[model samples]
Target chain A: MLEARLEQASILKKVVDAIKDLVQDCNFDCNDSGIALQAMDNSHVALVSMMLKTETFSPFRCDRNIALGVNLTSLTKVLRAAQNEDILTLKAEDAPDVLNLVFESSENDRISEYDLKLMDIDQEHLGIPDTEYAATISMPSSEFKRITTDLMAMSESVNIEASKDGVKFSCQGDIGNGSITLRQHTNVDKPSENIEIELSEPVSLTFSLKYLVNFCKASALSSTVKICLSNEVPLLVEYNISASSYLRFYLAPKIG
Target chain B: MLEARLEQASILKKVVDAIKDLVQDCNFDCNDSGIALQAMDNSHVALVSMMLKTETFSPFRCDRNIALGVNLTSLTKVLRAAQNEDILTLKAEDAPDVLNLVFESSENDRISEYDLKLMDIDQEHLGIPDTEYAATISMPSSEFKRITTDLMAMSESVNIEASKDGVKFSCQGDIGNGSITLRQHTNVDKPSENIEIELSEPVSLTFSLKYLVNFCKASALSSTVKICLSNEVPLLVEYNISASSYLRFYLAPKIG
Candidate 1:
């Protein structure tokens, strides 16, 4: 349903930047046809997940599935020097050895290439599980961000409790209180409109403010982000586009 | 006659900031309600002078000429923290031993109150002997800065040769060469543009690139700077705004 190709190299740059400090190796799974990356940081304190459809590309070009295990730190530095307008292209060579990354700009332009060393990521074989979430909410990314920042200022940490009905992100600090609550509503296109959630279960887990702030920084640079929470186990945050692309962030809840 | 005030605290701050590494004490001379400062850095390689007019303030108040020896480094740090817009009221109260320096930036918004022990400063009789200089030139502050930066990039030192016709600044480095020639052409506002020199006597001197760069940085923040030179002596660089606001940077010529 889509016709364009995303600068895979560009997306790689963003992912590497957002995750490198948190994790040594990232196990990225570009599903059967879609792209999805969801992993926790080193201490399992936070997780980031991303997903996007193939059509989000300018010249869409994915037939089979692709999973890339890349070192975030090394990749981020190389991309940091890249100009924003650089045309980044990434071609998956084989099952896992090396991915060919190319960046093209105007004539006399500069492209500092890097060979991303492959890594063996320990994939969490955590299959489907039952969940008892406290709350689930959906709101515009901007509104959600405003709440996040407000709450973040008040609390050193935030606890996200998600249930089938909605989600609640709340925190308390020396200064004041902060929270963003969303309940399942009807209208989907209008983010302002609410959506209702089935509260079969509720999950509440605490996480650091630093990781959330970083994610928000990257999210604010883009359009909108979606969040999924399942109690104290893991919190999933995803950046969504109106077109055919996907980005996700999955973080684990702090364990008592 | 002019009446101006600085929280004795603020004045001390300003003085301290002006004192770089080794400069310990300075003689401050104020007369007819105006203030002037001249101090030498530790190595005696550079000297700085600052003069402010009395008329610049409202309700001018000044009677006798007073010169007080002060510690600059400590004074500047305190004064810099004062609110720029704050009206600093300063007073020097006589004491048995130490000078009671009081600074008031509005009763509510005060930074610090310093008690600087006034020490006697040996006044240096500075007389720029009337020398038949080989080259003397005046240039806009910005152009002077560009030439200085260019010279710095070429080498860690600069050789200035002045003659009746104009002033030539050149620097040779491992990489390449850089030179800027300015001649006094015509008199008035086109100082940096004109070129006129007389070889009454020729003087060539070399100075440290670091000091020149620092002076240029400060002068560039202003409008125009005047350059005067002679061989084996310190080159005098002055940035003037009318009479009250005048800054001069003097650097001793380096030995071959």
Candidate 2:
């Protein structure tokens, strides 16, 4: 028997909602440390890795490290039933064939429980090697989401250039060329509100705006997002959940 | 023969909205006193009488007491085009078959107008007797609305008991019995927030929760509601719009 609780259902709701759009099915490896899910898109152009620390849950336990195979789409649909403020609890028996979700509204005395059928999906797990990225940029998550959305209307592909000065996102399409630049500001009151860029070398990469928009779906999970880019390498977009937990997406660069 | 102007369209929107569910077509008797609409539900189990006083409108005028026949459902559809805060103007020609509605959103500098066709509906005029009710209970409109909704799930009919102590609404259903009581309170900060009951004698009555729920749709028109009940007589639910304007519903009590 295993049970994990969340203070607010929004964390799991947002994470599942964002990941389901790109990843179809995955196994949630739940252990004493916490829960981790890693999956690649159907096209294999993008991969998403999500981690929730054990400390995030007030009371967390595990009989053994269990791989709970879940259909992401169905999981997202079940999460939609949860209110933002509802406390969420996930329960499963030993090698369970179903996942139980309970949402309790403490204020209104409302309780909603759902049982979702588990799937047996054979998914490939890729070992993501830690490489020295050429450039890394951190900016407000909302700004990144907005830029991706705006650039999506302009072109199917966007060229992201990072330097010591700042980072620039540009798109060229049938309409015209559009670009948005954010200068590194050091004197901001909140570090998360400022755009900061650090570059070992100036790097420019072209990526599919479609996948970038998909990655930006996690913007609501955090206030700031870190984007790591390198020449001819996959783009790593990370939303920090806590000091020890995060949700990250990696999209391969588009080539001519 | 009639022209009326409202600073905000929400007033008329709520009025027509609350009327259409119980009435399909109604004759808006426009006179110097104001516009009055009285119609019974399709089953004739309940009656809705709405009055908008002349002072309630910024510029209200009427050449004569002209009966402006209107299809309330169609009028409700036309009113949907109006913004909540838009300036609304109603105009009607002498015995015209259609009524014109103009809505101007000043902040957005937008204007929308609609012309709704009217219908001739044969309706009887009921002379409501001014008999002294056994009890009259005044409480917050939302509280009453909430009670009605909460009790509706428990039973089809609700019993209301009013006394000097307070008022209680009880329902019995397949699930169980549920009751909500409001104590008579004086010296409250906001008069609307307090519950007050004036009774010549304690009285108990049973009414269909469906009709009560229908009447509660007008709860948005006012903050407080006054319920007048008498033995073997239709229940009078009144929502005071302004100093002189009010919307009242007469729901026939269920009798064994």
Candidate 3:
């Protein structure tokens, strides 16, 4: 048995939309600690790991750890009807076939109750090891999003070269080639506009634009995005939801 | 041979978008008087006619009448890339195999010159006959666009009736039926906000929404739109571009 309430229902909408397309069906593992979601793309080429700590939700409670298997697309459709004035409540009956969700509007005393059918997904939970990433580039999500989309128009692959010089995203295509190098700038007035790079060593890696473009959907979840990359390891793209909660994506580099 | 210069290049983009989808390939008929475009939909049920006078261009010149055939979609793709800081010029040789257009940047003296190949399309020049209409309803283009779009969601056809009470647009679909009646209001301060109805006699006509909705695409060309309706003649929707230039669409009434 579990019940959790969120003051803003749109947050769930944003998180659902961010991860819905990457993995079709996933299990939302819930316990007293909080609600956690882990999934991998069909090809297992990309991994999605999210942790919504108990502090993220107000009046959060859970009696036991339960895996709430759900078809993400169904959740996407359900959450899309959320209104601004609505407060979302998540509910689950003790060991059952359904996961319950409630959207209550305080303005008009209106409530939309949805019960999602559960799926028995044959998914293996991957234990992600803590890695001391070689290079971590932190910048405004808007800046990151702009870089990904503009480069997407140029080619299907991007070569990320991060060093003391700066972070350079370069791509080449049949028609032409383009590249943008970004250096840390703290003089900006706004915190969201500031950029900082943490580098232990110079690193150069190539990634598929198709996956990064899809991962950038989480841009709406945070004002800043942190990208961690290493030469031979999968690149990790993390978006901080609140202070402690995060939705992270790991994309394996191409063989080439 | 022809040479025309336009201070504003955005005008071409607006006009091209206005009629791009209705008829794919059309001829831009150029003469000493001005430029004219006339095309019919694939179904031949709706007709689009546009006129741009020589006065519209800063320095217009033409030696002989020539019909330049083009794929409107290709022109749309090119003009959409137009910027506000650009001045446009059109040039053609005595017997041109290609139509040349130049976009000169006012800020940096940069120029983008494009030459589009002329298509050998056979289009019969149609002569438009003047006819008196029973009723002409003139209203704000925004109001007309809203009504068309709202009614579009209801059904595929609309019935319009005009009389002393003003004008009424009604539609019936499998689910239900809805109607909106408009009466002239002169109390508004602005002349564009006012509506006028000129009726020689009451007239009611049923038209396929598929065409009217398509014609409504030109709403951006003018602030006000005039609709002419007669007993047997085709309905005409008109949007004036300038004092002498105009864009008009003719759609025949559907059978009862």
Candidate 4:
């Protein structure tokens, strides 16, 4: 018997949503260290690595390490079908190839599950090293969703630049370009937050507005989203909750 | 130059939204009395009719009784693109063929016009009747949306029963048949502040859930929705305001 618990069903739902948008296949590697899935997209340019401690899931136990290749699309779709307040339970059937997902809600006593056959996926796991990101910021997910969606509608591409002063998000298209600088301030309407560039090497990167928009959708399902970025690499977006789960999404930067 | 105006963009948005769902080719018979569109759906089981008074729209002057045939799909697509906060403007450029929809806001400045060419519509202008409805109940639109949505989820069909106790919404399906009785109760959830119900005769009728669901989406944008029902006839749903503008939806009952 196996079990897991979370204060909010939304967090896992979000992680599944983001991964489903980019990666087709995933290898869920669970061991004594933790339950983690580190896989690269089909193009090999973008990689998504997620790590969750065993403590995050209560009554978690495994006799052997299982590297179950999962189809993110089917998994995410079935998860989305689950009720928000429901408790999600996942189990591997007698046939190790088949995985079952179940959600139980008090109001509507319905057990919905999707059985997906495992596939052979070739994934080159990349270990994320501990590096001091040039800039880090945490904000309410609602505000972040609004900003990202507005940016998506106005520009096809965006440049994120962070400095010692504040964080600046700017985008330029054939039509027009709009920039907003936000610094540490208390004003609710007009943001005074600016670029907070700390290092000698300022970090600036260009990324696709479409992928960012999808991330924003995932962000909407959570309260806070932490962003980490650097030059010439992917941007890392992490949503954290103590003793709940550690879910993060990485988007590869677009080069000119 | 042709121009029509409403203070809230949501009002016009909802009316267009509902009309777009039923009939694709519709003729707007504009006159000095009011701007109106009346036609039946392809199935002929239901009729679509809308009338907005001249006072509701300032600078609303129609020189000739023009039958403007609109493509509901194209119309709804353009309206859905508009921002809810923006002040929406619609203009007809003399040619009577092209329609321009404009959304004006400090942040969102955009104009999206869709070409609605005339289609060979079997046009028959539905005339207004002098006979009164058996029962009419006025309530908040939010409550209307919630009740309709809840019933639609549980029911394959809804049979509205009207009596002196006020209008009752009931539905029956394979699982169970239930009804929500909404009357003039001095309860906290519903204050006696804004409530009105008039009944000429007790009425009972059954209708399909699909048509009612579409009406709920249209009424979703309104602040208040009024419903009128009669025995073995059509159920008239009016998405109404205080006095300026009024939009009504009529659906014929299914005898199954």
Per-prediction DockQ comes to 0.02, 0.06, 0.04, 0.03
The superposed Cα distance between candidate 1 and the true structure at residue B165, in angstroms, equals 2.2
Error of model 1, residue B166, in angstroms:
1.9
lDDT of 3 by residue, B96-182 (tens): 777777766554233545566678888866788989999999898889988998898999999999996699999999889999999
Stretches of model 2 off by over 4 angstroms after superposition: A24-26, A66-78, B1-9, B17-69, B72-117, B121-256
Isolated chain B TM-score per model: 0.69, 0.96, 0.96, 0.82
Per-residue lDDT of candidate 1, residues B1-256 (tens digit): 2235642332333334434443677776767747777766677778876676665444345566566666554444334434444455444433212333323334222223334456767977376465544456666777777787878877889888886667788888899877887766675775555444555577778888877776775543346667777664678877764555666678888864
For residues A172-242, write the lDDT of model 3, one tens digit per residue.
65423445567776644566676788899988888888888888999999999999998767999999999
Count of steric clashes across candidates, in order: 84, 0, 0, 15
Q: Write model 1 residue lDDT over A173-252, tens digit each, in one string.
A: 43223344554555446544444454546567787777776666555435545566664446656565435555555566
State the TM-score for model 1. Answer: 0.48
B205 Cα displacement, candidate 4 (Å) = 3.9
* Model 1: per-residue Cα lDDT at residue B186: 76
Q: Over the true interface residues, superposed, what is the Cα RMSD of model 2?
A: 11.0
lDDT against true structure, model 3? 0.83
Candidate 4 residues B7-80, lDDT tens each?
Answer: 55666676777777677778766676767878776676567777777887755766666566676765554555
Candidate 3 matches the true fold with a TM-score of 0.58
Cα error of candidate 2 at position A91, Å: 2.4
Judging by DockQ, tell me the better candidate of 2 and 3.
2
Worst 10 residues of 3 chain B by lDDT: B105-114
**Using Cα atoms with residue i matched to residue i, what is each candidate's TM-score against the true structure?**
0.48, 0.63, 0.58, 0.52
For residues A1-256, write the lDDT of model 2, one tens digit per residue: 6799999999999888878888777899888889998898878888888889898776787778878898776676567656778798998888887777777754433355566677787857789897889999988899899999999988999999998998889888998888988888865577668888899998888999999899888888999999999885688999998787899999878776
